[PDB]
Amino acid sequence: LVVTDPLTRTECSACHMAYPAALLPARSWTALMADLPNHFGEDASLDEASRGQIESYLVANAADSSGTPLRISELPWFKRKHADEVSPRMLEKARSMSNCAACHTGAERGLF
Numbered sequence: 001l002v003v004t005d006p007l008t009r010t011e012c013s014a015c016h017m018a019y020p021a022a023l024l025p026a027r028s029w030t031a032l033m034a035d036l037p038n039h040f041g042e043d044a045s046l047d048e049a050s051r052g053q054i055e056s057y058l059v060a061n062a063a064d065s066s067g068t069p070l071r072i073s074e075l076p077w078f079k080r081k082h083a084d085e086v087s088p089r090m091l092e093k094a095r096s097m098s099n100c101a102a103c104h105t106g107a108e109r110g111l112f
């Protein structure tokens, strides 16, 4: 779906779309939030209080929440579904499978 949390939407849309919490399990969000200085080659670090607040939201709304991958793009379903649907040229043009909006026009609205 859609990141509604203002702090998360603000801090985590700085270099890419704000990935919805529901897309990763809690342990993956915790892992990512624990090493923001070394976040996929970039320094995404935050002040501690903010880090904990964002992490709490992500964990509470995670894929395995009530009611260790680091990438959505490495999940079993993701690999399986995109293998059929994405040409090598589509991938070349989008530059990375992380760039959901290059292919999904409604990504920022939770529409895939």
Ligand code: HEC
Pocket (backbone or CB within 6 Å): 011, 012, 013, 014, 015, 016, 019, 032, 036, 039, 040, 041, 042, 043, 044, 054, 070, 071, 072, 073, 074, 095, 096, 097, 098, 099
């Ligand atoms: C720039 C300084 C960044 C900020 C701030 C945040 N992220 Fe990031 N993220 C960044 C890069 C360079 C990448 C790799 C992109 C690529 O093409 O390989 C990522 C990737 C992610 C991912 C993985 C996407 C995927 O392939 O499935 C996630 C889940 C992610 N980032 C989350 C995330 C969060 C929660 C952030 C705020 C704390 C955040 N990112 C900030 C660069 C930057």
Ligand code: HEC
Pocket (backbone or CB within 6 Å): 023, 072, 073, 081, 082, 085, 086, 090, 091, 094, 096, 097, 098, 099, 100, 101, 102, 103, 104, 112
């Ligand atoms: C182009 C290079 C793409 C990028 C980058 C991402 N996606 Fe994608 N996705 C793409 C296509 C052509 C399709 C098939 C469309 C169809 O209706 O059949 C998809 C499919 C999905 C789906 C649906 C999965 C299913 O159960 O069938 C989802 C949920 C999805 N894509 C999500 C997604 C995310 C989160 C991305 C960034 C991390 C992302 N996609 C990138 C093409 C491309």
